[PDB]
Design a binder for this molecule. Sequence first.
Ligand SMILES: *[C@@H]1O[C@H](CO)[C@@H](O[C@@H]2O[C@H](CO)[C@@H](O[C@@H]3O[C@H](CO[C@H]4O[C@H](CO)[C@@H](O)[C@H](O)[C@@H]4O)[C@@H](O)[C@H](O[C@H]4O[C@H](CO)[C@@H](O)[C@H](O)[C@@H]4O)[C@@H]3O)[C@H](O)[C@H]2NC(C)=O)[C@H](O)[C@H]1NC(C)=O
Ligand SMILES: *[C@@H]1O[C@H](CO)[C@@H](O[C@@H]2O[C@H](CO)[C@@H](O[C@@H]3O[C@H](CO[C@H]4O[C@H](CO)[C@@H](O)[C@H](O)[C@@H]4O)[C@@H](O)[C@H](O[C@H]4O[C@H](CO)[C@@H](O)[C@H](O)[C@@H]4O)[C@@H]3O)[C@H](O)[C@H]2NC(C)=O)[C@H](O)[C@H]1NC(C)=O
Ligand SMILES: *[C@@H]1O[C@H](CO)[C@@H](O[C@@H]2O[C@H](CO)[C@@H](O[C@@H]3O[C@H](CO)[C@@H](O)[C@H](O[C@H]4O[C@H](CO)[C@@H](O)[C@H](O)[C@@H]4O)[C@@H]3O)[C@H](O)[C@H]2NC(C)=O)[C@H](O)[C@H]1NC(C)=O
Ligand SMILES: CC(=O)N[C@@H]1[C@@H](O[C@@H]2O[C@H](CO)[C@H](O)[C@H](O[C@]3(C(=O)O)C[C@H](O)[C@@H](NC(C)=O)[C@H]([C@H](O)[C@H](O)CO)O3)[C@H]2O)[C@H](O)[C@@H](CO)O[C@H]1O
Ligand SMILES: *[C@@H]1O[C@H](CO)[C@@H](O[C@@H]2O[C@H](CO)[C@@H](O)[C@H](O)[C@H]2NC(C)=O)[C@H](O)[C@H]1NC(C)=O
Ligand SMILES: *[C@@H]1O[C@H](CO)[C@@H](O)[C@H](O)[C@H]1NC(C)=O
Ligand SMILES: *[C@@H]1O[C@H](CO)[C@@H](O)[C@H](O)[C@H]1NC(C)=O
Ligand SMILES: *[C@H]1O[C@H](CO)[C@@H](O)[C@H](O)[C@H]1NC(C)=O
Ligand SMILES: *[C@H]1O[C@H](CO)[C@@H](O)[C@H](O)[C@H]1NC(C)=O
Lengths: 172, 172, 172, 318, 318, 318
Amino acid sequence: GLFGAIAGFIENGWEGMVDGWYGFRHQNAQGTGQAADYKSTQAAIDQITGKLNRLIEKTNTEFESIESEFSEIEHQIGNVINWTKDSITDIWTYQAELLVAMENQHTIDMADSEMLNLYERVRKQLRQNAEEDGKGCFEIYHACDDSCMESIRNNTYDHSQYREEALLNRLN
Amino acid sequence: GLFGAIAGFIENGWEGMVDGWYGFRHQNAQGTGQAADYKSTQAAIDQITGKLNRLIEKTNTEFESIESEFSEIEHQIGNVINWTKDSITDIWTYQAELLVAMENQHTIDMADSEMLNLYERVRKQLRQNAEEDGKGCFEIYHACDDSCMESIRNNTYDHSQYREEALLNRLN
Amino acid sequence: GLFGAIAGFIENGWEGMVDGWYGFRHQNAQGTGQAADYKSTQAAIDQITGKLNRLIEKTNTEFESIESEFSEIEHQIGNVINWTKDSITDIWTYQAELLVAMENQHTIDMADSEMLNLYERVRKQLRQNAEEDGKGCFEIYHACDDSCMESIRNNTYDHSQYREEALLNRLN
Amino acid sequence: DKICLGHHAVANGTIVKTLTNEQEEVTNATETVESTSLDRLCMKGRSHKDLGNCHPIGMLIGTPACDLHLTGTWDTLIERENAIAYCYPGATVNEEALRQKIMESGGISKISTGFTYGSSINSAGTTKACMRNGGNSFYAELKWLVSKSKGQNFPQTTNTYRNTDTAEHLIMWGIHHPSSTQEKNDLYGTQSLSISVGSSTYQSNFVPVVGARPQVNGQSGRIDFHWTLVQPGDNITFSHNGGLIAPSRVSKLIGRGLGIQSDAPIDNNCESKCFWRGGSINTRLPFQNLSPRTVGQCPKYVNKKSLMLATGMRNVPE
Amino acid sequence: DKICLGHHAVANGTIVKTLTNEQEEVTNATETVESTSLDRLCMKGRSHKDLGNCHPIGMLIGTPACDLHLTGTWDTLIERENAIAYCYPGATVNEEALRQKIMESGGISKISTGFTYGSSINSAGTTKACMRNGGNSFYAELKWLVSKSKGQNFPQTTNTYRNTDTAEHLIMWGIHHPSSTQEKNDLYGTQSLSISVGSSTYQSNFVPVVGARPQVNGQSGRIDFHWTLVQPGDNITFSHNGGLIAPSRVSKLIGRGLGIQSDAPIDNNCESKCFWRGGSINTRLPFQNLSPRTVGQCPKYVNKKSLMLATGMRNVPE
Amino acid sequence: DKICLGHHAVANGTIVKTLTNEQEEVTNATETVESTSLDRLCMKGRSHKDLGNCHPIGMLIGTPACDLHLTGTWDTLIERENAIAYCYPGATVNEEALRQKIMESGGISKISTGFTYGSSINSAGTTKACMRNGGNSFYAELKWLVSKSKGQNFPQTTNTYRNTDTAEHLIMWGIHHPSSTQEKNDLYGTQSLSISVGSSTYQSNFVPVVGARPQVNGQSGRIDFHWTLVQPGDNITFSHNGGLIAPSRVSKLIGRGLGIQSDAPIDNNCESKCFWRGGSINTRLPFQNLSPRTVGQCPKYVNKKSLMLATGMRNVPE
Ligand SMILES: *[C@@H]1O[C@H](CO)[C@@H](O[C@@H]2O[C@H](CO)[C@@H](O[C@@H]3O[C@H](CO[C@H]4O[C@H](CO)[C@@H](O)[C@H](O)[C@@H]4O)[C@@H](O)[C@H](O[C@H]4O[C@H](CO)[C@@H](O)[C@H](O)[C@@H]4O)[C@@H]3O)[C@H](O)[C@H]2NC(C)=O)[C@H](O)[C@H]1NC(C)=O
Ligand SMILES: *[C@@H]1O[C@H](CO)[C@@H](O[C@@H]2O[C@H](CO)[C@@H](O[C@@H]3O[C@H](CO[C@H]4O[C@H](CO)[C@@H](O)[C@H](O)[C@@H]4O)[C@@H](O)[C@H](O[C@H]4O[C@H](CO)[C@@H](O)[C@H](O)[C@@H]4O)[C@@H]3O)[C@H](O)[C@H]2NC(C)=O)[C@H](O)[C@H]1NC(C)=O
Ligand SMILES: *[C@@H]1O[C@H](CO)[C@@H](O[C@@H]2O[C@H](CO)[C@@H](O[C@@H]3O[C@H](CO)[C@@H](O)[C@H](O[C@H]4O[C@H](CO)[C@@H](O)[C@H](O)[C@@H]4O)[C@@H]3O)[C@H](O)[C@H]2NC(C)=O)[C@H](O)[C@H]1NC(C)=O
Ligand SMILES: CC(=O)N[C@@H]1[C@@H](O[C@@H]2O[C@H](CO)[C@H](O)[C@H](O[C@]3(C(=O)O)C[C@H](O)[C@@H](NC(C)=O)[C@H]([C@H](O)[C@H](O)CO)O3)[C@H]2O)[C@H](O)[C@@H](CO)O[C@H]1O
Ligand SMILES: *[C@@H]1O[C@H](CO)[C@@H](O[C@@H]2O[C@H](CO)[C@@H](O)[C@H](O)[C@H]2NC(C)=O)[C@H](O)[C@H]1NC(C)=O
Ligand SMILES: *[C@@H]1O[C@H](CO)[C@@H](O)[C@H](O)[C@H]1NC(C)=O
Ligand SMILES: *[C@@H]1O[C@H](CO)[C@@H](O)[C@H](O)[C@H]1NC(C)=O
Ligand SMILES: *[C@H]1O[C@H](CO)[C@@H](O)[C@H](O)[C@H]1NC(C)=O
Ligand SMILES: *[C@H]1O[C@H](CO)[C@@H](O)[C@H](O)[C@H]1NC(C)=O
């Protein structure tokens, strides 16, 4: 897609992730874990909400009937009304389809960008202590225990603390 | 937003910047300085101008009156006319609202991208001589004076010149 | 543009490329070569095809005539009809112009996106074995024969094999 | 040493259309076209009149089936199928324009014409076609004027209604069309029949059509109705020597209201702003595939069964 | 030791409009507005009738030009410029509504009225303005009734057509307006002329009007046509003493069809769903700039010569 | 050793609506819906005729008020409220069609009919309702024919206008309806009144309404006008024996023009393409919320106070 993450370099979605749209899996000696990111999930969710709200805001134009349900209309005026009504219906059908095709394209790409943004945020936080694996994972060149993994998720990871160790490993 | 820069990894705008849309702030041995970036600013303004140009191009359909202001219109035809006029008005109201909502979504994301394009250009400019801080700044690992800063702004920064000094400070 | 590649950090297109939208130029010990990427070319073309299929989907609304070609309509009903028809035409003309302008904006940016997605896929593949030149090239820091070049294009390049040699060349 | 970023997926996704893909799978989606209708007229919050048997035009002329609907006020007027306007056979010229006026209104008031007639006129003419209380009757707002004495010449007669109110009044009258000259002679005399109607903004002549024709509700005669508006401070004169079905009351249309044609039963516990032949449409959705013919504030009709709008990302299962 | 990424380009591409740029060059673009028409009527898989010289109304009254078109079935009906409806000069009330009914239809049947006339009526009136087989004739579906003996009063006459079908029938009749009183007297007598017509849904009176007027096809007289729908089970009565042009047959409209007005030649080998005065539009494009007046299922008409849809990236030449 | 990237901001931005956010603050934004009207008719670059208190139809028959507008040329025609068409009371059949015709045209020429009358006809009928120079007069383009000898019968009269021009002309005539049988006799006699009017593409008859009605401008009698088009080369004949108001001239409509109904004053120092009841709309904006009833080349009416287009990035203040 537009931003290259969802159905891009991230190979598939996580079906066991039920408490968020985006999040983290980790792996270290202590084991594997999975937690959802709150900030990016709401960023996506709130933008979807905005669209729903726009969808449901109602006009106020009152229309009366120009066609009798129970009696015969004069043929010539009947034909003008029919032509006009069908013309209006074609416009709205086309508009409805354009609206939904367009919004859909947008929400999918929006969802992709929020995933990318979260990826970029983690990358910059990790700075010179980690390397991209190309599948949406970061390989970390210092010992990162459950607690270290947690600071990364919480945006409080301090790269100055691990830089010395991680640089040495990267050069091997 | 879409490209993660404006109201993204860059925390806030600069009110002090009155001579342009995108810019630089620097700090070194000789204090601080603030300059605008011409090319990114123009790219954005030009794209805005293009939309306003589209907004003001005039359809020349000449309409006549079908509704007398000064005498009574036969009731049936008057009702058809009213149904039709209101239908058309609902379409245009709907069109106008969608046009602007979409356009606004686009200009916001276009502007965001021009920030990201400027950022990415400078990132490559500095190559291995600097590191990202995550907040829209680059930490330069060598002595970079006012002549050096200007060359980054002017897009004439040669990285080979400082590579040796930079890499040494980057390791320690 | 939106993504910074096409009409951005990549200087221009290659007119020599006739079997692809996107691809590779290399220069090593054994000279130069050119190859188109099948995957990203088909990604872009499929989306273009998708749009063209939307463009041609028909509505089966059958319209009768409400205007005689060969005899005169009563003047008032004739004016109403003219007013309605012209209004309907202004809407479709507007819709048509908007659709095309929007689709075009989107296909240009989608094409830019695919170029960036290929670049990024290659950037991460090389890992630490190469560097960005800012004009869309990667400067590789090892002996990379035609056979190594093919593996980068084949997406089976293994940075492990060269990292030792490459890092030494980079740190000098 | 490994931290991986990712997104959620579901087992069974939903297909939506995008600009570039007819068959795109997303994690969730919601409908934008209303397919559901309430088969009731939702009348909560509405001062409504259900006309039942009564045709809106019958309110003006006073057909018996309209006796409960000769005056009143409403914000919502409901017309049913097979409603009766004409107990005695005939029709109104510009019928649909009139029907539409009554259904654009919020009420009806009735004002006397004050018309009186010399002793040579029998103004109490009646028909078996308009039954009331088991007796031959006539439209409540009009008088069937015939010669007191059978075969005698209906006298030359003038009646003028004056509008002293500050609104326009809607006046109606009828022309009787006999089924034979014998009947015409019996009712009105052997003279040539002429009906002239004149106001300051309207005038027309009327002549009774006489000829054989099918019996409708037992009658081969016909009474056709005609109408016009009389302006504040204006007068309307009738000049006639037989054949005029003369008004005894004229109407005044009050305010604005919404007119609905439907046979759906009324429900006072749901509220609605959109109505159609089959009932009420209560939706927050902007489109509907129920009917092209609706009244009120309505979702736009579209020729689509379904339009799903994505409320999630691309679904990329494992 | 270098690898470089790039995209293709062409020497010169096409200009398209975007939201932000009116002069945007791309590698490839395609037209969205149809500019081309087939200058013929594409009639493959259509049961069609080309009326040639026959005007749709002439089918119902049986004008000579229409003799091959008194009955038929079709799903597409084609009307040509200058088609003849009236041989004897005249016109039809509510003509355009009637023309549209015929053109919305899928066929015409005829049913005999059965009308017969006493020996003092001559039903064989003919005119040199309606030529058949080099001889004087008349509208096939109607009869010109005149007094058998010149100058005598046409007798009081009654004719009732009974619709025994389960479908409504279209009855037409004519009223003759003579060019002079002497002509009027010769044809129908010196008596005042009256024609009354009555169904259970329609009644009217008609009076022949003598008057000097210009010659059309050599005739200063006129025959004006009237029509009404007779319901299944209903009857329609004519009372007349001269001037009636009485129907010998009535029409029944069958099914639905598409009416087309064009002088484009018919082609049985191409198919189409969109027609206009100039021919047929066969396109997959959603828009069209040939004509605002089209019939069938058509691309939408737009006020643009050209509108290019980009099918490739930005063209950035070397 | 540090260089930071950023973007500008402001102290107070403006709110716009996006697809996702009703309340997005941006640096700058601009109005897309015009709310301002100019309260004059911007007539610069236009050859215009202000009709004052002359009604379009008055121009054809020659009401005193329209004496300065019987012929002329314009590209813009301006009708005012309460304009006079009929000095003598009456109406034109199909008035609104004719009004619109005149308002679609760019001029009027007048061509004499050449109608002369026998010495037993008085062509100089006048009225106190149409005053010229303080004297009883009549419509400039018409003549009120009455019997020369009071009460004695009006003779059968033929008048033919021949259109020898290369363009269709518009002919008008009136039918006088008396207020009593007495008045009817003095003017025309006892005979029944028949007015037949016939060209080769039109015919009709008229019977004049005799009956009491209100006084309008002191007159109970009425004159109702009728109109038809006469094609090049065609003749139109008037066969009449009383009650005809005969044309002394016919009209020719020239070119195309824009018709404006407004009471806003003319301003020759602004140009505009869009007009409404309250003045002119000259804006470059595509939308407009002043009035649904505009003429010319207009921005589309929308039901929106305001719609702001973002002309700058998100505003993220310090
Ligand atoms: C303007 O547009 C409206 C709406 O489209 C038209 O009104 C329709 O007119 C058509 C005739 O073309 C009607 O269709 C006919 O319906 C018959 C059954 O009617 C019942 O069922 C429908 C179901 O929706 C109800 O609407 C209706 O009230 C009845 O309860 C069918 O029996 C007819 O079939 C015909 O064709 C077959 C061929 O298959 C023949 O064998 C038969 O002889 C038969 O004639 C027919 O389809 C339709 O009922 C109307 N719809 C509505 C909503 O009123 C106007 O006529 C149109 N005006 C114009 C062109 O002037
Ligand atoms: C609703 O809208 C329709 C469509 O616009 C109107 O119909 C048009 O009416 C105009 C008159 O304003 C017609 O224009 C006239 O055309 C004449 C030529 O005849 C043919 O023209 C083309 C040939 O390609 C065909 O479309 C058409 O079928 C004709 O066969 C010209 O002779 C006229 O020119 C005259 O005007 C100039 C002013 O510049 C004067 O100096 C001269 O008098 C000059 O001769 C004129 O241009 C047009 O043909 C009509 N179009 C169609 C498709 O019918 C309706 O009138 C309108 N209805 C209402 C009620 O307003
Ligand atoms: C087609 O639409 C047009 C334009 O909307 C419409 O004309 C309008 O009709 C309304 C009546 O529905 C008129 O409104 C009146 O105008 C005056 C102001 O000049 C008001 O003060 C009036 O108030 C009265 O309304 C009450 C109803 O709620 C009455 O009970 C009482 O009399 C109040 O005093 C009233 O609103 C209005 O003048 C026009 N508008 C225009 C621009 O002409 C037209 O009738 C429609 N056509 C058909 C056939 O329905
Ligand atoms: C005298 C009698 O009883 N005749 C029997 C026929 O009944 C009458 O038939 C005549 C037509 O010949 C009318 O239809 C009569 O209808 C009424 C009616 O009820 O509508 C009687 C009303 O009093 C009368 N109203 C007025 C104001 O005159 C009304 C009108 O005359 C007509 O409607 C005007 O068109 O008619 C009806 O009672 C009966 O049809 C016949 C067959 O069995 O037997 C006759 O003995
Ligand atoms: C139209 O004419 C027919 C035939 O005259 C009428 O049919 C009659 O129906 C009645 C019942 O009402 C029966 O007594 C007979 O079957 C028919 N009468 C005769 C004398 O044959 C029909 O009623 C007439 N008019 C309509 C239906 O309006
Ligand atoms: C109506 O009649 C009254 C009473 O005769 C009269 O005074 C009034 O002026 C008339 N009004 C009109 C408009 O003719
Ligand atoms: C109309 O009048 C002319 C001239 O008097 C005459 O030749 C003929 O009767 C008519 N001609 C045409 C072309 O209508
Ligand atoms: C889709 O399901 C999600 C929960 O998984 C919910 O948030 C959303 O409202 C649902 N939409 C519909 C239409 O069911
Ligand atoms: C545009 O040209 C290309 C070749 O460059 C071709 O493949 C394609 O079919 C053309 N586009 C369309 C829409 O036909």
